[PDB]
Amino acid sequence: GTILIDLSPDDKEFQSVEEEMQSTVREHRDGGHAGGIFNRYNILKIQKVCNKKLWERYTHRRKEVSEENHNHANERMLFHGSPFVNAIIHKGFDERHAYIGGMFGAGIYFAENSSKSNQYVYGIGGGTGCPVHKDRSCYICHRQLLFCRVTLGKSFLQFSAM
Amino acid sequence: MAHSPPGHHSVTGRPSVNGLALAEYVIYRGEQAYPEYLITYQIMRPE
Ligand SMILES: O=c1[nH]c(-c2ccc(C(F)(F)F)cc2)nc2c(O)cccc12
Ligand SMILES: [Zn+2]
């Protein structure tokens, strides 16, 4: 029971999400190998994802985390890139969407940098790039990212050589 | 799927080498995220 509602480009909500995308691109140490070579995006569409059940699942967990963390959800908006983006919007996140070999263990990973999440659109390490051209730096094919509401609760701080 | 560190609900990966890199975050329960926006885009070739 997911619906997707288009945001008008004239709408401040669209513009806020576009600026979050654009302002958090950076250079990557692979010179663009995984995600491609770019300084900015062409944003083609932004849709709101609405699902009453998935939303309730989320707010139920958030309340438990918030109470366990002395009344602080520690909620953020973060990017997620995945080959499963089309499954995620219908069924929600679960173990099928985890990065088994991640830096900080098997869990679901999110980025403040839009361009970090873009590295996973076509799979781990960018996989073999777009389906049509096998190009990790394809400038023609349309990509999708999610911008998500994430409950962090008490977060363990791990400094990392990356 | 792995478990969050004892008493914690997520991990915050803070890059310590590259100063322009922002943080990455891991959760261990899918219920702790909601995919609020779907963004369709192309990367752009620099000029
Ligand atoms: O958005 C991310 N997706 C992923 C990601 C990594 C793997 C998969 C997989 F395995 F399901 F195909 C899906 C998404 N990893 C990230 C990361 O390691 C750091 C910061 C952000 C991400
Ligand atoms: Zn392509």
UniProtKB/Swiss-Prot annotation, chain A:
Superkingdom assignment? Eukaryota
Chain sites annotated for binding Zn(2+)? C130, H133, C138, C141
Start and end residues of each PARP catalytic domain: 8-162
* Tissues where this protein is expressed: Highly expressed in placenta, skeletal muscle, liver, brain, kidney, heart, thymus, spinal cord, lung, peripheral blood leukocytes, pancreas, lymph nodes, spleen, prostate, testis, ovary, small intestine, colon, mammary gland, breast and breast carcinoma, and in common-type meningioma. Highly expressed in fetal liver, heart and brain.
Q: Where in the cell is it found?
A: Cytoplasm; Golgi apparatus membrane; Nucleus; Chromosome, Telomere
Q: Impact of changing M103V on the protein?
A: Loss of activity
Q: How is it modified after translation?
A: Ubiquitinated at 'Lys-48' and 'Lys-63' by RNF146 when auto-poly-ADP-ribosylated; this leads to degradation. Deubiquitinated by USP25; leading to stabilization.
Q: Tell me, what does this protein do in biology?
A: Poly-ADP-ribosyltransferase involved in various processes such as Wnt signaling pathway, telomere length and vesicle trafficking. Acts as an activator of the Wnt signaling pathway by mediating poly-ADP-ribosylation of AXIN1 and AXIN2, 2 key components of the beta-catenin destruction complex: poly-ADP-ribosylated target proteins are recognized by RNF146, which mediates their ubiquitination and subsequent degradation. Also mediates poly-ADP-ribosylation of BLZF1 and CASC3, followed by recruitment of RNF146 and subsequent ubiquitination.
* Assembly information from the UniProt record: Oligomerizes and associates with TNKS. Interacts with the cytoplasmic domain of LNPEP/Otase in SLC2A4/GLUT4-vesicles. Binds to the N-terminus of Grb14 and TRF1 with its ankyrin repeat region. Interacts with HIF1AN. Interacts with RNF146; this interaction leads to ubiquitination and proteasomal degradation. Interacts with NUMA1.
- Family as reported in the entry's similarity comment: Belongs to the ARTD/PARP family.
Listed name of the protein: Poly [ADP-ribose] polymerase tankyrase-2
Q: Which gene encodes it?
A: TNKS2
Span covered, complete protein: 952 to 1113 of 1166
